[PDB]
Design a protein around this ligand. Structure first.
Ligand SMILES: *[C@@H]1O[C@H](CO)[C@@H](O[C@@H]2O[C@H](CO)[C@@H](O[C@@H]3O[C@H](CO[C@H]4O[C@H](CO)[C@@H](O)[C@H](O)[C@@H]4O)[C@@H](O)[C@H](O[C@H]4O[C@H](CO)[C@@H](O)[C@H](O)[C@@H]4O)[C@@H]3O)[C@H](O)[C@H]2NC(C)=O)[C@H](O)[C@H]1NC(C)=O
Ligand SMILES: *[C@@H]1O[C@H](CO)[C@@H](O[C@@H]2O[C@H](CO)[C@@H](O[C@@H]3O[C@H](CO)[C@@H](O)[C@H](O)[C@@H]3O)[C@H](O)[C@H]2NC(C)=O)[C@H](O)[C@H]1NC(C)=O
Ligand SMILES: *[C@@H]1O[C@H](CO)[C@@H](O[C@@H]2O[C@H](CO)[C@@H](O[C@@H]3O[C@H](CO)[C@@H](O)[C@H](O)[C@@H]3O)[C@H](O)[C@H]2NC(C)=O)[C@H](O)[C@H]1NC(C)=O
Ligand SMILES: *[C@@H]1O[C@H](CO)[C@@H](O[C@@H]2O[C@H](CO)[C@@H](O[C@@H]3O[C@H](CO)[C@@H](O)[C@H](O)[C@@H]3O)[C@H](O)[C@H]2NC(C)=O)[C@H](O)[C@H]1NC(C)=O
Ligand SMILES: O=C(NO)[C@H](Cc1ccc(O)cc1)n1cc(CNS(=O)(=O)c2ccc(-c3ccccn3)s2)nn1
Ligand SMILES: *[C@@H]1O[C@H](CO)[C@@H](O[C@@H]2O[C@H](CO)[C@@H](O)[C@H](O)[C@H]2NC(C)=O)[C@H](O)[C@H]1NC(C)=O
Ligand SMILES: *[C@@H]1O[C@H](CO)[C@@H](O)[C@H](O)[C@H]1NC(C)=O
Ligand SMILES: *[C@@H]1O[C@H](CO)[C@@H](O)[C@H](O)[C@H]1NC(C)=O
Ligand SMILES: *[C@@H]1O[C@H](CO)[C@@H](O)[C@H](O)[C@H]1NC(C)=O
Ligand SMILES: *[C@@H]1O[C@H](CO)[C@@H](O)[C@H](O)[C@H]1NC(C)=O
Ligand SMILES: [Zn+2]
Length: 912
């Protein structure tokens, strides 16, 4: 048959997508939450318009007791005040309710749908839920906060919980006298009810999707300032943490300005609120006018927050602010095109931080975003940027490295192609065109391809007003359709192309092929995954003679350009701005490496980190033996650009940790030696201080951490000295932030230090400190402590459970812990599920956070079996395949190149 209701009747409607016959225009929403009962009583009146006559209305509701349902109208006199009662049937399987009407409704007539509902405050990071913080005095205090994206709005009021059903919202909220209440838009009025309660009436909203509605009740304080635009920006936090909001304010004002100018679009609201929520699963959520954060994302305290931390805090404020346009002013049509929000937001981070905090050096850190997402696009299990999704759980999965980074990287790839100007003018022509409504994937390429430059040029020139037929316009319309084709290739093909370059004297044979990790070229598995995959890759290259940047658009599977000067080497994808790996056949890889050991300044600094990255990724592909990737780090002795230095190193440091976790002592013991010597010079220049530039500071941290993990006797001596000095000061002497984490994890290696550290985790007012303390706590050798941390996190009283996920991962990466963590997950999967949504980001990082590092044929089968057991019940996530392929990639990489690592390091000890 078809759906059956809770009362055992029927649902008029069978799909989980909603019906487009009734569409909502306005929500009168009223919420009265009682915070000492931990429940809420609410009501709502939805002005709807029906386009096609109907017998039944369909909404979403979940875990919501509905206790009254009427229908009124002022255009259809049958439902004239008071109005006839409706009868509701709940179909909990699609999270839908059906309101059933007495008489067929009239097309083109507005009705008001009214419901009273109630529920207990949720206790789990979604919906309208409870949250606790700690005061400085030791008091513990409660607030209630909403988190809705993507589909939990339906858990706090009945509604049409899809983006595109955009409406206006009117919120009134009732509160005790000791609380305040915030929501999306500033408060108009506060009427005093008679018992002493208060009713906050909020300015009603501009048209917006449901997942963005927010309300909060709490007792936070705030610092306020104004933009040059006239917005009141206010950072809200726990009373005692108010100090820590100053930089949030500083940066968000500067940023909100920048965004307004760059988009040519004012922020539409009158207020903008940043609040720091103590219990909060995401990094932060872009509620229009009321942005919510983990404290670690928004709060900054200078005695304890690191300079990296400030870069982080500046990044997420950049990101959420960008959503005000990309997300709220323009929302994706459906969750397939979620990258239309996140992709653009991740990218604006870069332009906006670079624009407003050049000192934060964020342009040298953006290649990590692409590099990370690349190692997941090197597997078959990867998806494309736009993929269909229908159930809640699929939608949540849609928020991943792909939706965020691949989207942000191909954007930055597009910009280099079109140029900042022509890119900005296409962005404005899109946010302006789709303001207050929705846009699908294609719409974005359309307005970015039909972008005009220098305004309209001459009004009556090359743009839409009274244009002039010229052989430029036929190539402008031709170049416009060229780019709309090329991008659509990037957005619907999974994976990332690898371009093969062969230099045969003035002749370069270009080949493209999907890049694949843990699969060789001579294999049965490889030429069947080269199915139909072909991209329009906009190439770039500089030769060894001239610094000229040539630019060709390869649209074929083979192609040949002609080199005129025919010189020493040729570096493709200059500055690395293009989403693709280049591998040189012949002596190409050999010419470039010698160039690095001779000068190395003959290749621009981005070219280098691209090479370093490209090189090692290609031994993952079998296309290069490991001794040519290691041979490159020899020039790091002279390397002066910190980015290249740190990429080089991490690769080396990855290996050391791969050698531990297994017992590969002799190799691990030699990596330790090839690092501590041969990078001794640079390590020895490092201050134990916060003095220097941002990359100076970052490199000190990176390096001093390296030597103290490798038991380098001096470093561990000095970090100990600072630690006991700190503890013998009862916290009176300050440790420089940049060695703060290193000192705690050196001190943690003893039960004293450790127990003092755990005791001060519970007393610290700086969640930046607490986070560093946790890491240190996690680095303990005893499995007694490690497990106590784990259980403390489950409880959620001492270590708040929002950290459990990340805690498990710190433990599992370290050898004395990888097993404990993996055992704990399997022995508790059911229990862990009651706390998190399978498909929540928290679950996906517990699953891959304890399995991804595995690299032996035995562990693989534990997992394939554990995953199989999960699938058996109501369970399935894409992370299952990606974990497997990754462990596989590691097994292959170990057995193909381990003897070469072993032998390379042995050789090096001979020559020096
Ligand atoms: C969430 O729900 C909680 C309860 O679960 C509510 O808290 C209660 O709120 C009600 C109403 O605000 C309170 O009820 C009133 O309490 C008075 C007693 O207060 C004493 O306080 C001091 C002690 O220092 C004495 O000096 C004083 O004389 C009292 O002994 C009663 O006397 C009240 O009755 C009289 O006054 C009212 C006020 O106008 C009149 O209407 C009556 O006719 C009557 O003459 C009244 O019963 C109750 O005390 C609160 N309890 C607690 C523990 O706080 C929250 O208000 C609610 N919050 C929200 C947002 O909904
Ligand atoms: C629901 O939200 C929409 C926004 O998406 C509201 O539309 C906006 O309505 C206002 C006022 O009706 C328009 O303001 C303008 O102000 C100047 C001031 O003098 C006036 O001269 C203009 O003629 C205009 O009214 C605004 O342009 C409009 N914006 C959009 C995008 O439509 C709508 O009013 C909201 N509905 C309710 C019931 O609140
Ligand atoms: C990060 O911010 C800096 C600061 O604006 C950006 O650098 C600037 O980029 C613009 C456009 O790329 C430069 O304009 C052009 O410069 C070249 C240099 O010769 C010139 O020939 C062109 O005709 C044009 O004037 C601008 O000069 C440059 N400023 C500086 C100080 O370098 C940078 O682009 C930003 N990065 C990103 C990724 O947005
Ligand atoms: C690796 O290649 C770079 C680029 O050629 C080398 O830097 C360059 O070194 C030469 C000297 O061998 C410099 O020449 C000098 O130029 C000044 C005027 O600019 C002139 O007045 C002097 O009499 C002298 O001829 C050249 O300027 C310099 N390039 C830059 C940008 O400063 C680098 O030294 C090479 N690495 C080596 C040789 O180890
Ligand atoms: O950016 C957002 N919204 O626009 C945030 C997440 C965020 C905020 C600031 C950042 O600098 C980066 C990411 N966000 C997602 C959701 C609902 N989906 S979720 O599955 O529960 C989930 C949470 C976090 C997820 C994540 C986190 C890193 C990478 C990939 N993914 S994914 N709510 N807020
Ligand atoms: C909703 O109503 C509209 C308009 O009454 C329907 O649109 C008509 O559909 C028929 C079907 O072939 C066409 O021949 C007409 O030309 C359409 N007219 C208009 C004005 O759109 C629509 O099919 C109805 N859909 C549902 C699901 O009820
Ligand atoms: C539903 O509305 C009617 C209107 O007369 C009211 O009497 C009734 O108490 C309401 N139900 C509730 C508040 O649960
Ligand atoms: C916050 O700033 C004020 C002003 O200097 C100071 O009195 C207070 O002690 C500060 N608190 C912290 C934790 O820095
Ligand atoms: C690779 O992915 C494709 C499409 O997602 C799928 O058909 C194929 O089964 C995958 N490879 C393997 C070995 O299963
Ligand atoms: C490594 O080898 C030594 C040699 O006996 C052994 O005692 C130790 O337990 C091994 N470590 C692991 C993790 O197997
Ligand atoms: Zn986002």
């Amino acid at each position: 048959a078809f759906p059956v209701a809770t009362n055992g009747e029927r649902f008029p409607w069978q799909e989980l997508r909603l019906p487009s016959v009734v569409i909502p225009l306005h929500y009168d929403l009223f919420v009265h939450p009682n915070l000492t009962s931990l429940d809420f009583v609410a009501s709502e009146k939805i002005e709807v318009l029906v386009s096609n006559a109907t017998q039944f209305i369909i909404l979403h509701s979940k875990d919501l007791e509905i206790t009254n349902a009427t229908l009124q109208s002022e255009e259809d006199s049958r439902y004239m005040k008071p109005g006839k009662e409706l009868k509701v049937l709940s179909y909990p399987a699609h999270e839908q309710i059906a309101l059933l009407v007495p008489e067929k409704l009239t097309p083109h007539l507005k009705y008001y749908v009214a419901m009273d509902f109630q529920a207990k405050l949720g206790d789990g990071f979604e919906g309208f839920y409870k949250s606790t913080y700690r005061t400085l005095g030791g008091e513990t205090r409660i607030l209630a906060v909403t988190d809705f994206e993507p589909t939990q709005a339906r858990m706090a009021f009945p509604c049409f919980d899809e983006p595109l059903f955009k409406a206006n919202f009117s919120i009134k909220i009732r509160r005790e006298s000791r609380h305040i209440a915030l929501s999306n838009m500033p408060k108009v009025k506060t009427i005093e009810l008679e018992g002493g309660l208060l009713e906050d009436h909020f300015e009603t909203t501009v048209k917006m999707s449901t997942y963005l509605v927010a309300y909060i009740v709490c007792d936070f304080h705030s610092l306020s300032g104004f933009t040059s635009s006239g917005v009141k920006v206010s950072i809200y936090a726990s009373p005692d943490k108010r100090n820590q909001t100053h930089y949030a304010l500083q940066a968000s004002l500067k940023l909100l300005d920048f965004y307004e100018k760059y988009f040519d679009i004012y922020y539409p609201l009158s207020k903008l609120d940043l609040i720091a929520i103590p219990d909060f699963a995401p990094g932060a959520m872009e509620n229009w006018g009321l942005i919510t954060y983990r404290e670690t994302s928004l709060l900054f305290d200078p005695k304890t927050s690191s300079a990296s931390d400030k870069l982080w805090v500046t990044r997420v404020i950049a990101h959420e602010l960008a959503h005000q346009w990309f997300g709220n002013l323009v929302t994706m049509e459906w969750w397939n095109d979620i990258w239309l929000n996140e992709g653009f937001a991740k990218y604006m981070e870069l332009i906006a931080v670079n624009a407003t905090y050049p000192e934060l050096q964020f342009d040298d850190y953006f290649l990590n975003v692409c590099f990370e997402v690349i190692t997941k696009d090197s597997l078959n299990s990867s998806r494309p940027i736009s993929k269909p999704a229908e159930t809640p759980t699929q939608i949540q999965e849609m928020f991943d490295e792909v939706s965020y980074n691949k989207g942000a990287c191909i954007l930055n790839m597009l910009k280099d192609f079109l140029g900042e100007e022509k890119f900005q003018k296409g962005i404005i022509q899109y946010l302006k065109k789709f303001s207050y409504r929705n846009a699908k994937n294609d719409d974005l390429w359309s307005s970015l391809s039909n972008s005009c430059l220098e305004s309209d040029f001459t009004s009556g020139g090359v743009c839409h007003s009274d244009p002039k037929m010229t052989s430029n316009m036929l190539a402008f319309l031709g170049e416009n359709a060229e780019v709309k084709e090329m991008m659509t290739t990037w957005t619907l093909q999974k994976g990332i192309p690898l371009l093969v370059v062969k230099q045969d004297g003035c002749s370069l044979r270009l080949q493209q092929e999907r890049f694949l990790q843990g699969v060789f070229q001579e294999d049965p598995e490889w030429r069947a995954l080269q199915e139909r995959y072909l991209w329009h890759i906009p190439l770039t290259y500089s030769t060894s003679s001239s610094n000229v940047i040539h630019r060709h658009i390869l649209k074929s599977k083979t192609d040949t350009l002609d080199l005129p000067e025919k010189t020493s080497w040729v570096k493709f994808n200059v500055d690395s701005n293009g989403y693709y790996i280049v591998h040189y056949e012949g002596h190409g890889w050999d010419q470039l490496i010698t160039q690095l050991n001779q000068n190395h300044t003959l290749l621009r600094p981005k070219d280098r980190v691209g090479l370093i990255h490209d090189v090692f990724q290609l031994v993952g592909a079998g296309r290069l033996t490991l001794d040519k990737a290691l041979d490159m780090t020899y020039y790091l002795q002279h390397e002066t650009s910190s980015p290249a230095l740190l990429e080089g190193l991490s690769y080396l440091e990855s290996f050391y940790h791969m050698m531990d976790r297994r017992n590969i002592s002799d190799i691990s013991e030699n990596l330790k030696r090839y690092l501590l010597q041969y990078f001794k010079p640079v390590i020895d220049r490092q201050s134990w201080s916060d003095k220097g530039s941002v990359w100076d500071r970052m490199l000190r941290s990176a390096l001093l951490k390296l030597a103290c993990d490798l038991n380098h006797a001096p470093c561990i001596q000095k970090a100990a000295e600072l630690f006991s000095q700190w503890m013998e000061s009862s916290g009176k002497l300050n440790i420089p932030t940049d060695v703060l984490k290193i000192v705690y994890s050196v001190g943690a290696q003893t039960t004293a230090g450790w127990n003092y550290l755990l005791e001060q985790y519970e007393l610290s007012m700086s969640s930046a400190e607490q986070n560093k303390i946790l890491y240190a706590l996690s680095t303990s050798k005893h499995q007694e402590k490690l497990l106590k941390l784990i259980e403390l996190g489950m409880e959620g009283k001492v270590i708040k459970t929002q950290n459990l996920a990340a805690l498990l991962h710190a433990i599992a990466r370290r050898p004395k812990g990888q097993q404990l963590a993996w055992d704990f997950v399997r022995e508790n999967w059911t229990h862990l599920l009651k706390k998190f949504d399978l498909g929540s980001y928290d679950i996906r990082m517990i699953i891959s956070g304890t399995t991804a590092h595995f690299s032996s044929k035995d562990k693989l089968q534990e997992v394939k079996l554990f995953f199989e057991s999960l699938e058996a019940q109501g369970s399935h996530l894409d992370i299952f395949q990606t974990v497997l392929e990754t462990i596989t990639k590691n097994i292959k990489w170990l057995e193909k190149n381990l003897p070469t690592l072993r032998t390379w390091l042995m050789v090096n000890t001979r020559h020096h």
